[PDB]
Amino acid sequence: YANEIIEIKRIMGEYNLLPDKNSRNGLKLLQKQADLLKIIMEDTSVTENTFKNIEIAITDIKREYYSHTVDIEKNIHAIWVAGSPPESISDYIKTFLKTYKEFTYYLWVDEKAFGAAKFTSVLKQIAFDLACRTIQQNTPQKNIDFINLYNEIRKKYNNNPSGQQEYLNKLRELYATYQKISTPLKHMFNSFFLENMIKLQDNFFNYCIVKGVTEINDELRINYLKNVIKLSDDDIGNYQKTINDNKDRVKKLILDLQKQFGENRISIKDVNSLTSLSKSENNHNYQTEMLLRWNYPAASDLLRMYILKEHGGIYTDTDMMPAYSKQVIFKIMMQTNGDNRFLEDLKLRRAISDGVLRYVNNQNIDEVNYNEISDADKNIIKKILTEISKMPEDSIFTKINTRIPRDTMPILRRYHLWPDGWNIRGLNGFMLSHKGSEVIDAVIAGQNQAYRELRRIRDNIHSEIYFKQTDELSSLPDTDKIGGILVKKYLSGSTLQISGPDLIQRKMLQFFRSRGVLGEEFINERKLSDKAYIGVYKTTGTGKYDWLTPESIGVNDVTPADESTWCIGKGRCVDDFLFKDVSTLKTENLPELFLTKIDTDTFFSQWSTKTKKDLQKKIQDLTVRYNELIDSSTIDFKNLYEIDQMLHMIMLEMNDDIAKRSLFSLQVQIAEKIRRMTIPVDNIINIYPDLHKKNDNDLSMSIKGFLASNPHTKINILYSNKTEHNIFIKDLFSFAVMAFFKKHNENIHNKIQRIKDEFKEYSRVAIHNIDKVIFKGQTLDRLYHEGYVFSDINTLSRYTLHGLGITGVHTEENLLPAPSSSLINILKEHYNEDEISAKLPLAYDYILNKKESSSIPVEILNKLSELPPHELLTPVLGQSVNPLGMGYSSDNGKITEQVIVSGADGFDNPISGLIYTYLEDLYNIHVRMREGTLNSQNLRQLLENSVSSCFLTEQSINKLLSEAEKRPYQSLTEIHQHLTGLPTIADATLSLLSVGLPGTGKLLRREQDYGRPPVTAIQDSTFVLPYNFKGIGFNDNIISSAPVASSLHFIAEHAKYTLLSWPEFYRHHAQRWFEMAKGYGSQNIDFHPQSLLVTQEGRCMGLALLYLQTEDTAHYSILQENLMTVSALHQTSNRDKLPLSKDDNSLMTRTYSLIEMLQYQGNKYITNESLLHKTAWNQERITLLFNEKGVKRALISTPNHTLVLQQLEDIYRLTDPNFGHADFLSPIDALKFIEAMIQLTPTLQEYYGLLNKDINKHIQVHYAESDMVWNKLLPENDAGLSTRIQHTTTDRLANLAEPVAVAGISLPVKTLYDIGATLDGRRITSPPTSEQIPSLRLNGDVLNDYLSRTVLTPEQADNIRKILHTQGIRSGTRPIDPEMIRGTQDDLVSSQTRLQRQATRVKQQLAGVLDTLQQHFQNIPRSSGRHLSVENIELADIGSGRFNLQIRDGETLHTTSVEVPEVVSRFQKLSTMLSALPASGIMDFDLGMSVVGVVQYARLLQQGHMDIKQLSEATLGSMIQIAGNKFLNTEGIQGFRLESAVAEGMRSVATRTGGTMGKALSASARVLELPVLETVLGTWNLYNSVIQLQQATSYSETMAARVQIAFDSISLGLTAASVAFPPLIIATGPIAAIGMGASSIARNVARKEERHTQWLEYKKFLTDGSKHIVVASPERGLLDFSGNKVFGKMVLDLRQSPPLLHGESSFNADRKIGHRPDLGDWQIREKVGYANSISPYSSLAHGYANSKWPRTIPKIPSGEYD
């Protein structure tokens, strides 16, 4: 306790050295003393004498602390409410003046807000009309009678301005009608009303910003009203009449009051003469309160706090009188003979108060209202008043104590005898305080926070509107209840309070709790004790309160004009309402509510002729670009900068005001768009710990919490060893001025090592040294080398590391994930809102660790242990920031730097470059300051070419120079503060951005003073500070607004598909998908499979939400094309491991970040029943929803997958991300197709998670009550995915028409990019200059991949070989043998293309086969060594692909079970085709090519011969050979070679089926027969030796590469060498095969078999003819139609850049009905009538009488064909 006693001594000694102990500093010192003494009490010492001594000392400190009391000022304050009658106020004012002789009465009057009631009423009318219109015209399911009646009575008023009381009565009746409306409609009404009123207030504040006004008066309000709507002179006359009436009433009342009493005794104080009114921290909340209030006859809650803070004294309402003296109560008790009914019930007390007030004011006592009072009570009250009237006027009332403790605000406490008992509570209608009290400041801050949280409904874009929160009197101003109260007040005209007594009590309790031990007497069971109030009555009787000797003297609040009598007795005035027909609304002047494009025909309507002639042409040049910027789904900052700069220039170059207002409306639209377009945040958290605390418990808790919150979140712990060394050196220098190195190094090393080994098993936690990744020329490196030690080094390091590409969240505090709604709900069972915050640390300790606390019930522990940790904590995923790039945490509305949330990788980050340049400038100023060489000239020169020059004012330069002279060595933050005057670098971000955004940035900065959130402030906080568990957001509460947990789909350890084998799933099911979609009536089926997510974790929610967002066919097509492009890019990047250009990588990262965020949001939304309705799969209910309930979108959720049903235009489109989309005319058809697709296919059913399950209870449909909800949840910033087509590098390079001269040959830039030409380690994105050409290198992997899928001409191969021989292969990539770069003639291009396609298919199938084999081998009880060795391979079942093998594990382990029906079926089909070929010359070229490639792969696997992976590959080869031998060796010859047999079969096929196909088959057979080529063997050996071993990729990729090598070796037989200068012209066309026509198959059809088998043969012929109508090779400019057989009357038009193909497809026909393509299978069956209507779909004839061959006309790729 040397860390307690010494500071106790010094704080005591400082307490002596206080000339005036009656001050806040003395109170703080005493608080510190008592806190340290209580900390000493917490020790384990058991000495009772010590306990007594310390408690006596604490009592002494408390007694000394309470000895400091302040005498309040002799001021009595009251607020005059507009429209108040002066007769009911003068009596109470006179009573208070008479009772308080030595007091000054001040009546606060706001002369500028006399007519604000009519302005507020007009705004409310506009807001309610807008809400009604939004409800009506967006609810097409049914009409609402309430809106119709509202419009009818408004139209009835439109003809009778004269009488309005009838209108208010009709509105009351209409509210009685409205009470019966449905609950969701009520919630929507409340939300829309509140949001519209807030938006109108924002519009008024924006108008104030335009006009540049400093104060707000009634003239400005009238001008704004004329701006928004049309005001006749009668409305202005009524406004002025009510203003004059209020002025005259106030003047007459004050004159009458000053005639009797003194002139200076009572006076009028102007409300506008208040400092707090113009304070920027108050956000002009006084003006907002005039609109969002429902207790209009009462006074302002903020104004009384302002008055008490700035002046001090007593505030009282104008309906209260001083408390009765002892004599009065005494006489009442004797006159009532001891009955307590006359001192407790409201009616008799009110009558007695009326009598006393009448008697004191020299009025008629007999005229007291004795209503609802019995006659005997009337007589006894009369005699009581008669006895009282004999008393002197100076003893009727008693004063109150004016001595209060320093920094305290006593609050009046009331006792009301309700029929159910007592209703003790505090009232803000009578308060006491002195000037400058701290508790008033705390209450004001609480009120500001309350208004901030109330504005959350409008400020938060992603705010849910269907959230029926329970009634709990929570601190959050529940928007639903407040909106309902406001609607009731607007309609009816007659609880919760954002700044009422409840908030005052809560803030006072918080202040007293933060006081410490001295505040313990103010706390009474976590509430406010009796010492915090006045008028407290002690209950001497069992329950009755002794009305004789109260603890404190209060005030008689039961008066004839109190809150309970003015509701009925005082009718609503007619001077606080102004009826206006909203139909004349000017929607172009309201950018906050209406998004209006600039229309040149009507934009310049009210402009002056001079301004029109000046700048109409200039503005008309902005219409297209401005509209594109407004309607875009992404932000292009260059266009935004240009448009904003020139709009600002035009604005500054004007003299008119209407045109200025229109341009400001455009700027406001720009600002709103900037606000609304948020971007995702990477799922990364970076913590910069302070290694000087010796307590890593908080850091470990933070790491554990962020680990448990999500299993994908990366955690980076970043520390600087150089900073620790500099700190140690500075400490050594200080110790010297005022062994060790080894000790400090060991200490730091052991701390870091402990942190590292605590989370060693977690790969997501990485501890990194900052100095290891820092550029040498960077500012941070120079600061490290200069011994920078200042505290802001960590903030500068955070900024630098973000600038280095480390995205995510950067913070220094030990942040903890915020609790989710489930955890708060669990804790709420036996806790209140004020105890959950204190109990949260225990729950967090029990969740992350496994510590059990005795202070928490075991039920809580049991309920928490049953839920996953990720369901109770909020992860970093799903967060978002402003489009500017960076976000900051807030503290009481001011942005801080505790948490920095920095965008997502791939998105534009304008703030990052500004911060980088600003830090460079600050470092330059620092180095100039250090050497004392900083004056004005070099200061201006340093920022001469810098954005930060905007801060160079004369006073800023003077301050910088003065501080440099005073202290040459200053921190960078201090330099920035001196230069700019802003507290933090975060504040300077908007100022820096305003240089490039002169108008929008200035407007956004100005709007901060009117309550709008800062543009760089994060609102939804997913983090909490460890010490208090308080959120770091702007307007959020972590307890009453906790986020909903997200449903995480648990996946298997092994996935069914990888990226290599993923297309097999689509290929196996695409035909069935199309057939069954067409059979159910779909007239448009489109295919666009996704290759982005190969694992069903997340259930494809992101893609489903992306497709659901689009509301049009054009946007749908754009999004589908963009998703296909991104899928291709992802396949190239990940499956092939090929480098990508910067733009393509950025696009992929943006798309993946959006997909992850959207999938998280969708999984969150589906599990929350309050947002989206959820129903089980029922076709009738879904049809009713889509037909009667006005539902246009829905999410069909299988346990593993998600589908989308939409209502684009008039069609109903169903989207399956894995396949594509098909649209139907009616919803029932789509639902039937969905159900059929789910049930019919077993593999698809198992993959989707519905295997052996009832789908009527395992399929859920998610929809919204209204279509607005989707617009609210789905983000607006789509990165341009659904509005514009994103072009890759190849697409842009294809537009260039100039070639590049490389190695003496000119080739296009696109071709150079395709072959992998890398410049300076990057793939070329632009035509390289002649200087950079010698530095060009060819990427081996890219070149190999290009050669894999390209059929070059011999000249192209020659050119590629020349380029390779001149430039070479980039080091570290795949070497390429020049002899492998060959070309083919025109007649073999189709064969080469089919061979390459077969190679791809075989690779994809063998990848899955190898994965299955590896899983089988891993399922074996292995011990050690190379024991796994297959002993025999044979296929027992030829019809199913079952192989039996034995393993020489050494323990005799045998598992003879593996299903490989892929290799077996290929050879089965080959044998069948070979045997049946002599009967009819029908063969499959693709099947033969695939068989040849597989055989060659096995043969290459033979030569050049042991872990599980290579064993599996060798086993696959062995099974290939075994299947080939079984299905090809008819006779058991020992000297049997599979290659020879396959070659002989191919030669037989080629001889019997001649032509170019026969030539290709002969070439492949010859390749198989001959020994492997030297080049092929060299390539195989080089790969297997160096390239596979060097890379760490999976074995599947290596196997696929080997298969590709084998297929390339097969492909070498179809190539030919170039011929130079051919002397003679030869024939270069393909040769037709024997049996092209349909007579060949018809010859075998004539064999007497089943008729349906003959039709199957005919259909096979038709499908083969339609499969290969066109083969396009735009690289060579070749079009191949030789495979066309069933596309008649073909017309090829090469005039257009994409050639047009037209023709007639072969079709099915029926004898009676003919060909009817427009009908589905069921309609065709009904027409023909060949079956029953209840027959299964499998019993029908699919494709009958409605089939076409080909299905659709093929599309020729764009190119130049010769």
Residue numbers in the entry: 241 to 734, 751 to 994, 1119 to 1885, 1897 to 2153
Question: Anything the authors wrote about it?
Answer:
Lymphostatin is a key virulence factor of enteropathogenic and enterohaemorrhagic Escherichia coli, playing roles in bacterial colonisation of the gut and in the inhibition of lymphocyte proliferation and proinflammatory responses. Here, we describe the structure of lymphostatin from enteropathogenic E. coli O127:H6, determined by electron cryo-microscopy at different pH values. Long linkers hold these domains together and occlude the catalytic sites of the N-terminal glycosyltransferase and protease domains.
The C-terminal arm adopted two different conformations. In conformation I the C-terminal arm was shorter and more compact, while in conformation II the C-terminal arm was extended. At pH 4.0, we found the same two conformations with some 40% of LifA attributed to conformation I. The ratio between conformation I and II did not change significantly upon changing the pH and conformation II was the most abundant conformation at pH 4.0 and 6.5. Vice versa, conformation I had disappeared, which suggested that conformation I was a low-pH form and conformation III was a high-pH form. The rearrangement positioned the ART-domain at different locations relative to the N-terminus: In conformation I, the ART-domain was folded beneath the delivery domain. The relative arrangement of the domains downstream of S1 (S2–S4 and ART-domain) changed between conformation I and II. In conformation I and II it formed a compact entity with the N-terminal subdomain, which was stabilised by a hydrogen bond between the subdomains (V1731–Q1776).
